[PDB]
Design brief:
The structure is a homotetramer of 496-residue chains.
Chain A: H1 15-26, H2 30-51, H3 57-74, H4 83-94, H5 107-142, E1 148-153, E2 156-162, H6 163-188, E3 190-191, H7 207-213, E4 218-219, H8 223-228, H9 231-257, E5 265-266, H10 285-296, H11 298-308, H12 324-343, E6 345-346, H13 348-357, H14 362-373, H15 377-394, H16 403-414, H17 422-429, H18 431-437, H19 446-495
Parallel strand pairs in A: 3-4
Antiparallel strand pairs in A: 1-2, 5-6
Helix pairs in contact in A: 1-12, 2-3, 2-5, 2-7, 2-19, 3-4, 3-19, 5-6, 5-12, 5-19, 6-9, 6-19, 9-10, 9-11, 9-12, 10-12, 14-15, 14-17, 15-16
């Protein structure tokens, strides 16, 4: 445990919590993050040129062996991570044949392809983390089917639910965001190589080959769109922003739960900090830095769209990027909230107490009057509203409101009495009966939530299966490319 | 023609152009736009309550007849277009039974459903307009397979293409945006009714029935998500923003084409204005107001996401909306650019002249040296760069560069001569040969572009078919609801 | 009271509250808002032309009388509120001499001047409302110098303060925002007339005269800057956004205070609503619609800056505007929060109770150990942190922590005892003594806050004086212009 | 010259150009940028505690000597750059007395003060760079009083001006932005130390002393505002964004000037790049990366304001920061555009040619008809518009339009002839006479622009004087603090 773990900040920070403090100093520049993908593009482009007869196997093998050498130099020399200095280092290593690797190619389609491969890997990384986020949310829900508590609207107690019911709302939010990310992946995972500067080339390239060797699923067909297309960058920034906004809302929800006044939940010690001056603080540092990441995600979205609004439909060096440190912040926040949800400690007795005492059961009292004594809904509302006004005025908790108070309210509001028993009123005000009566689809009754959990468990299986399939497709292509490179270098070494 | 049609502003404004001036004063408030959908929800909810036995057929028919009456009052009384004043007008019309239409319902899920139905209709309206935009772009492309012109990168002449090739880049951009809109529609077209305040209800509703009567394809299952879910609003705002950013880039592209210095295109008179003080102006008012709409679309996107980042995962009156005047601006801009593209007049001779004279053919000269005399690509680049530096210095247009100038550049740069003929150089510098040599996938050669046009023509057929299917589904549901309402009112009038 | 005033929504909405519901349907378009200022510019320009000898007094009087006539037509004919249709209506009224009012002028500098005059009036309107906001905040503070309560950091109870101390934080925030608005006014209140299209004119205008007649304090000198300058629009949008963000933070603060769990404040009935289904709701509709206005203000700021980033330094029809409905939303939110602050009802007993019982007094216990028994600050912190951990574990409220609990914590943490009396501990934990001990500058002790109130009362006097001076300058100029117009029309009628 | 300097990319990149490529990899984290200011705060706080008698001179000297030691450790150990790990390293060095440096202090007011000192230094750095930007713009203008060229509106040639006239528009823009930065500095340069956690302290601090030792000009008085105030961060982000938007507009303007079609300006070789595939490219890489920086500046502004809209008026770890790499991007872009403006090469002959031939002189022809033959302004406009329509139709350049063409247009449009000479028409169409006739305030006539240059030269002197004064105030305080530290350490070493 480091020096911030003093007083009530007991134990060490959870590693998910620690990520929130580390990502910024640890993030790569976009140039350094994309550089390893430029190397892969060089090999796939050279292999494709070799299959097309633009390069001989001897030329190809000289280039490919040199790529490995310059790749090793650039591991410690950042100046070799942009195209032309890299090419010049390659030319100093293997000679003038290094220049031939740029046949039919530009920096424009090379940079668009490399950025796509970077965002592609970061997209699967994101999808993996959001799946783990949803897993923690669903698995937590399954343990709280009977954890009765109030739900809020406008930050006011509304009606009784369960913690499991609340968490499945988050699960449905995450399922739709996973669809957004998967829909985006289909547009990110297209290869623009072969567009060259913006208009293709007279060299007889095989664009499908280059695309396949790099794991892309299809082509960015039109060559202008290949170098000028940037909407997938804006879309990636947007889904990041809207997903994180839902994460901010849950962090904010848990933060209010764990205020000194609510006290219906408490953060795990490993996800809280304290003050150096106020020893009583158990601070939601994990929650607030997670929200901060969500707020910061607005930045790339606006910058990218602003740059697109400011140019023509051309290749342009003025377009704003989605940078590694932005995605790194998202992953840190997602992991932190995963651990926050997993380790959250609800005060079940305080939750039930608020539900039973603070008048969220009044809707069921109103519905009972309408459904049992058959008064108009507005008139039942006016009676129960008077009940609450009086109960508050006299200090009577909701689970102490009885037949007398209801009748005086009726008489006070309608002149007439009311035709109900004390048992009917008691069952209307029982908060657990409130939950059980709400047994429709998507409602908090345990059997309803359990059905939602069964559906989410099945959908999570599809989520992991999609991620596994997309990951293996990239791994298989990366292996085919590596095999092709060895075949060319070894064959030239031994038989040519 | 109005009073702005003076001097070079001849004829009347195209009606698509005129839309850009009218939408703001003509736009409805969100309340007035959503109100007709609240009326439909009332009927569908009441019908569902009747099928469930919560309302008798007599109660149902009294309510339904009263809804038509209050609907007629609210046509001229805006104060009756929010829920509770509407309900009070209904209660003054048919009596206290009006209160029963709110059984098992809240304003929270009513407003979420109504806003969805509004955005749903506006989404099909948007998809229709974007289809018409893509239609004008593809059909224009088919008439310019041989309209040779330069493409630009970084606002500098790059290589020769055709106008048809350029327009098919826009078509590919629009196809992906149509996917974004259709993906969004699947999330917008879910029914949150039955969530009531946030936690469902003990009343035995049939949520699938209410959803079907209103044309929704599925449910927003979880009841918290039903009233708290707002990501589809942010997503709708985003796709609007990213689509319009592509529209801004094309408007900007056409604006540079039609500058007094480029002069490669001229706006149709019906899409241009003029100055009251400078009589020589033919101003791109249509283009700049279209870009203005794209810039303004950033606003709702940021406001909506900011409001989501600022709350808990609850129903909240603090969430920012996507308003009718924002969508109205998008439609006006899309229609205007549809007409701009349809009626655009390119100066084909000036386009060819720039391609032939301003050195965009230098890549093919460089590729010819590498591919024919077999020099290293960097060395060919240095020779052709010297050719251009000299040609500019001496005032020699690209289509006048001959064998001499190329050899002196070679000698000046390599000491050695060069092993090419004047015919090889002439064919390298022929701009139409530049286009023909680029015959790969997505490249400007007429046969390549024609293939892209064939594909887009087929995809446009799928686009219109999707829109027709989604539209008819809503029309059929609206008719079923209307039939159900008449059955209840007429049966009660005659047989009960 | 309208139909939303049911149940606990007693009485009628405060008119400041009602503004939040009315501004959107009542807002003018920018064109209709700026039109009356275009009329004033016409008169000031014509008068200036008359002084310069460009117009005769007879020509001037014919034009001026015609301006009044067309002004009356345009009161009901919106088509006459853009320049050229207005001019054509003027020409149909008085003849071809109407064309002479545009000598040396363009629509470009006319629109820039008119928008400035609109924003100028709306800026004084804003400054007036923010002054009233600060007045309500300071005057409320003066009545709560002894209203002890906790302040929060990270939504956790921190240390004891007073409500008056909290409100003076808001006052200091508002004082700096008033400086932002006044600094902006100096840049808004410059006249760009005389720039004509963008490059001035050969006509011998007197720009100082036109500026003075319209109440401007100086010129936008350079003629390009006159028509192309737009930063004051972006700046106006920004100050709106940052001011409202502070208003959102106070609304959010009051919303947490008035949660069912805090219960340290209650909104006045005239600033709260209720639910149609949940009769127990007293909802912070005023607070959440005020925050919504703050979130929406992000929109114009981004749209305006995006449009500026997208063009050249020219006049351009693509620039995004600050529209009346945006400023209207700000004024409604400012008025609402003015009334919210004025009528807010704090529960003083609950406030004191939290301060005394929920451990915000622990800092003073820690400071007492360091200052009295002379232990290292970290060691005192570790002892008091143990006190809190134990007190929470045993259910002991802070104002029940005594000598025993402190000594056992010392022994548990240092092995040694502690050299303090029960009276020292009791005074360290007295929350009102916590407040009194913090008597430095800007601290919550009543004498400190009272000094801050004395300073703010004096500054508010300067605020109102600045507003009065700027307002009277505009009123005097508007009268001089009106007198000049009558002099020209009457003199021509009677003596020429 | 590096490996990107090939072909037409001759010589080495200007160092201002090179900054655009280096700042991102070279930028510090906010933590590492603020750390040296935390060290200064420690010393100033300890000195203040010593003057107040809270620390003895021996305690003070032990702490101060230890601060230098830990400062040296943290130069290579980034883990020691947050408060509590730093304090723990101090405690391991000098013992438990290290804990006393936090008396009456929190991390909350320490971080607010340190961030202010960072932004304060970066603000003077920004003001210095913007002054150098304005210097290059004014000094360039002084050399082009007679460089006749057209000005554009809506990207169309408008009227003749001079390059000097255009640049003075930029100067007036920069003067107002310098006012924004100086107004901000007054709010940034306030000391929040003494606020402690949020509510001050019972320790008898002297806040004015701490403020003075750190160079602040005043206090953030209220203690809540001291830790919760964040508007100066948002304001700093905004002025950055609006200033850069003006820089983007000039970069965009110069980019269009230097298109292959305009050809009225050419970037200096040291500020241009080229393509690896297209040898004819001279690319505006400096301009587009400068615009990219302007677009990216939208990000921090939105993120900061979003975070403020999302919290209460408290200290909060969720607030978004203005980070060093954002300010670094601004400085790189400002320096680059400074060098771009200084070294820009206008083609004066092409500029004059466009002015003389492409009809920007038509306003003066129209004004001449009104002022000389006394026709109505609309009728003159219709005649000159017909002149242009015919001149374009027949290929007649503006400086070849003579008496015949004007008369036929008159006859074609009014039936009547026109009463002007060929000499009157020739002088109306002389572009240099157009400039000379516009001799009012802020107009392009050389004598007018020269007056504007005289005013700017005087204002630039005030700008540098303000910067010098604010800089020396900080330098003097930093020296007083250093002297105080030596006095305490040396006195304790030798006499105590």
């Amino acid at each position: 445990p480091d020096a911030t773990r003093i007083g009530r900040a007991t134990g060490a920070k959870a590693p998910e919590f620690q990520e929130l403090y580390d990502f910024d100093a640890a993030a790569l520049t976009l140039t350094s993050a994309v550089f390893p993908y430029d190397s892969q593009i060089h090999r796939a482009h050279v292999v494709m040129l070799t299959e097309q007869g633009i390069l001989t196997v001897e030329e190809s093998a000289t280039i490919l062996s040199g790529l490995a050498q310059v790749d090793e130099l650039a591991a410690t020399d950042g100046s070799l991570r942009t195209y032309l200095p890299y090419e010049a280092a390659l030319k100093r290593t293997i000679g003038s044949v290094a220049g031939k690797m740029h046949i039919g190619r530009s920096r424009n389609d090379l940079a668009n392809a490399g950025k796509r491969m970077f965002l592609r890997d970061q997209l699967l990384r994101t999808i993996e983390a959001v799946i783990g986020y949803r897993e923690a949310v669903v698995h937590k829900a399954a343990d709280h089917l009977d954890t009765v508590m109030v739900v809020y609207t406008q930050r006011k107690e509304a009606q009784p639910i369960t913690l499991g019911h609340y968490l499945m709302a988050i699960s449905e939010n995450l399922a739709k965001n996973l669809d957004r990310y998967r829909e985006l992946y289909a547009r990110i995972n297209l290869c623009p190589l072969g567009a060259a500067a913006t208009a293709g080339t007279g060299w007889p390239l095989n664009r499908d080959r280059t695309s396949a060797l790099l794991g892309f699923d299809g082509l960015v067909v039109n060559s202008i769109e290949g170098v000028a297309g940037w909407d997938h960058v804006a879309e990636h920034a947007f889904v990041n922003a809207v997903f994180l906004s839902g994460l901010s809302r849950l962090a904010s929800e848990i933060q209010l739960w764990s205020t000194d006044e609510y006290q219906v939940a408490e953060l795990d010690a490993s996800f809280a900090g304290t003050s150096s001056i106020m020893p009583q603080k158990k601070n939601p540092d994990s929650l607030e830095r997670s929200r901060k990441a969500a707020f910061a995600a607005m930045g790339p979205l606006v910058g990218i769209l602003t740059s697109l609004n400011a140019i023509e439909y051309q290749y342009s060096a003025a377009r704003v990027e989605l940078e590694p440190r932005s995605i790194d912040a998202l992953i840190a926040a997602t992991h932190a909230m995963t651990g926050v949800v997993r380790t959250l400690h609800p005060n079940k007795e305080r939750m039930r107490q608020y539900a039973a005492e603070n008048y969220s059961t009044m809707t069921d009292l109103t519905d009972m009057l309408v459904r049992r004594v058959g008064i108009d809904y507005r008139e039942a509302h006016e009676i129960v509203a008077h009940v609450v006004i009086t109960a508050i005025e006299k200090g009577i908790k909701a689970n102490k409101i009885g037949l007398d108070l209801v009748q005086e309210a009726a008489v006070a509001q309608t002149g007439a009495g009311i035709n109900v028993s004390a048992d009917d009123i008691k069952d209307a005000l029982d908060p657990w009966q409130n939950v059980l009566r709400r047994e429709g689809k998507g409602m908090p009754a345990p059997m309803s939530v359990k059905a939602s959990i069964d559906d989410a468990m099945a959908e999570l299986h599809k989520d992991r299966a999609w991620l596994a399939n997309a990951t293996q497709a990239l791994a298989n292509a990366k292996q085919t490319l590596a095999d092709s490179v060895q075949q060319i270098i070894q064959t030239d070494r031994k038989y040519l």
